[PDB]
Scaffold this active site. Structure first.
Site, PDB file in Angstrom:
ATOM      1  N   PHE A 243      32.144 -41.804  50.514  1.00 25.19           N
ATOM      2  CA  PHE A 243      32.719 -40.523  50.876  1.00 25.19           C
ATOM      3  C   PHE A 243      31.186 -39.132  50.999  1.00 25.19           C
ATOM      4  CE2 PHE A 243      30.212 -42.094  46.579  1.00 25.19           C
ATOM      5  CZ  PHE A 243      29.219 -41.418  46.413  1.00 25.19           C
TER       6      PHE A 243
ATOM      7  N   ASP B 214      43.178 -43.508  47.637  1.00 24.27           N
ATOM      8  CA  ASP B 214      42.085 -44.381  47.476  1.00 24.27           C
ATOM      9  C   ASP B 214      41.739 -44.825  46.232  1.00 24.27           C
ATOM     10  OD1 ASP B 214      39.854 -45.859  47.997  1.00 24.27           O
ATOM     11  OD2 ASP B 214      38.162 -44.247  48.588  1.00 24.27           O
TER      12      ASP B 214
HETATM   13  O1  LIG Z   1      32.433 -34.663  41.177  1.00 21.20           O
HETATM   14  C1  LIG Z   1      32.061 -35.972  40.792  1.00 21.20           C
HETATM   15  C2  LIG Z   1      31.045 -36.829  40.760  1.00 21.20           C
HETATM   16  C3  LIG Z   1      30.752 -37.714  41.216  1.00 21.20           C
HETATM   17  C4  LIG Z   1      29.816 -38.756  39.756  1.00 21.20           C
HETATM   18  C5  LIG Z   1      29.461 -38.115  39.289  1.00 21.20           C
HETATM   19  C6  LIG Z   1      28.207 -38.562  38.142  1.00 21.20           C
HETATM   20  O2  LIG Z   1      27.238 -38.063  37.160  1.00 21.20           O
HETATM   21  C7  LIG Z   1      27.606 -40.288  38.458  1.00 21.20           C
HETATM   22  O3  LIG Z   1      26.959 -40.903  37.708  1.00 21.20           O
HETATM   23  C8  LIG Z   1      28.718 -40.514  40.311  1.00 21.20           C
HETATM   24  O4  LIG Z   1      28.334 -42.152  39.731  1.00 21.20           O
HETATM   25  C9  LIG Z   1      29.384 -39.958  40.067  1.00 21.20           C
HETATM   26  O5  LIG Z   1      30.847 -37.850  42.026  1.00 21.20           O
HETATM   27  C10 LIG Z   1      31.731 -37.653  42.930  1.00 21.20           C
HETATM   28  C11 LIG Z   1      32.309 -38.319  44.268  1.00 21.20           C
HETATM   29  C12 LIG Z   1      33.029 -37.296  44.985  1.00 21.20           C
HETATM   30  O6  LIG Z   1      33.297 -38.063  46.583  1.00 21.20           O
HETATM   31  C13 LIG Z   1      34.142 -36.181  44.991  1.00 21.20           C
HETATM   32  C14 LIG Z   1      33.488 -35.922  43.564  1.00 21.20           C
HETATM   33  O7  LIG Z   1      34.128 -35.118  43.646  1.00 21.20           O
HETATM   34  C15 LIG Z   1      32.893 -36.037  42.859  1.00 21.20           C
END
Ligand SMILES: O=c1cc(-c2cc(O)c(O)c(O)c2)oc2cc(O)cc(O)c12
Length: 274
Positions: free
Chosen positions: A17, A135
């Site tokens: 991503f 997805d």
């Molecule tokens: O908002 C989040 C937030 C996270 C995120 C936040 C955390 O606090 C965490 O521990 C994660 O593994 C992912 O990951 C993503 C991945 C994406 O591809 C798009 C997103 O909008 C986000």
């Protein structure tokens, strides 16, 4: 305006991503997530209403934000020489379903129902805006552990919703339907339900039902955990090999198993120790 109206922090992740960071908008101390995506690594591009060239993820996000929940909203974005910073909301505390399941194995049905229903409503919202996520899975679902609310993430694989046939796919293979594996064809709504199907199994069994293509095409589901006759029926319906034998979103939500769902707050009070 400039890029610096946010105070960057740690790295909450990275991968296919992109690379997501922990920011805090200085303008009013609001928690935000900052996603960098290199221009060079993007595949699908669209154009914004105002008529400018952006990644499809931005177009979709914008369409699907506006109003509330189900989805992590996109507050703003910026264009740099070789990337795109996306400013998204960061509610907290939070854990993604893949991590959550990994920690606690299969979930109880009362919890899977709150989660699956919430997921269901968020997909409905996405389809109303003219977006197909493509997805949907445990890794792309955040859980606001305090309020008991799930939110959708990662549209980098999505597309504008349409009634014609899709001959392209770039999401997760194991969640992709049989019709895609065999002819490289699918209809958004049909294929969505199938991934939702894989996701329901995943929740109640603690892991996905199909690993190989030989298992998707065959479409026979073996249950590894104790799972109610009703929950098994819905999972199997959502996974009908024939796309038109799969349920609508309405059909899924009127199914016996989805009655008397718990509200977000109740859900955290009981199952998230919150
Ligand atoms: O908002 C989040 C937030 C996270 C995120 C936040 C955390 O606090 C965490 O521990 C994660 O593994 C992912 O990951 C993503 C991945 C994406 O591809 C798009 C997103 O909008 C986000």
């Amino acid at each position: 305006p400039l890029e610096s109206q946010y105070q960057v922090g740690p790295l909450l992740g990275s991968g296919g991503f992109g690379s997501v960071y922990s920011g805090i908008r200085v303008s009013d101390n609001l928690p935000v997530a900052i996603k960098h995506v290199e221009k060079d690594r993007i595949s699908d591009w669209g154009e914004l209403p105002n008529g400018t060239r952006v990644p499809m993820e931005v177009v979709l996000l914008k369409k699907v934000s506006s109003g509330f929940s189900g989805v992590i909203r996109l507050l703003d974005w910026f264009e740099r020489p070789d990337s795109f910073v996306l400013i998204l909301e960061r509610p907290e505390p939070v854990q993604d379903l893949f991590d959550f399941i990994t920690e606690r194995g299969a979930l109880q049905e009362e919890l899977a129902r709150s989660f699956f229903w919430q997921v269901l409503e968020a997909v409905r919202h996405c389809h109303n805006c003219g977006v197909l996520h493509r997805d949907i899975k445990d890794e792309n679902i955040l859980i606001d552990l305090n309020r008991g609310e799930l939110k959708l993430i990662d549209f980098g694989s999505g597309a504008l919703l349409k009634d014609t046939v899709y001959t392209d796919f770039d999401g997760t293979r194991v969640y992709s339907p049989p019709e895609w594996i065999r002819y490289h064809r699918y209809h958004g709504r049909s294929a969505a339900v199938w991934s939702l199907g894989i996701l329901l199994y995943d929740m109640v069994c603690g892991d996905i039902p199909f690993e190989h293509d030989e298992e998707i095409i065959r479409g026979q589901v073996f249950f590894r955990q104790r799972v109610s006759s009703e929950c098994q029926h819905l999972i199997r319906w959502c996974l009908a090999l024939r796309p038109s034998d799969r349920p609508t979103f309405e059909e899924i939500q009127n199914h016996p198993w989805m009655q008397d769902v718990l509200l977000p707050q109740e859900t955290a009070e009981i199952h998230l120790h919150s």
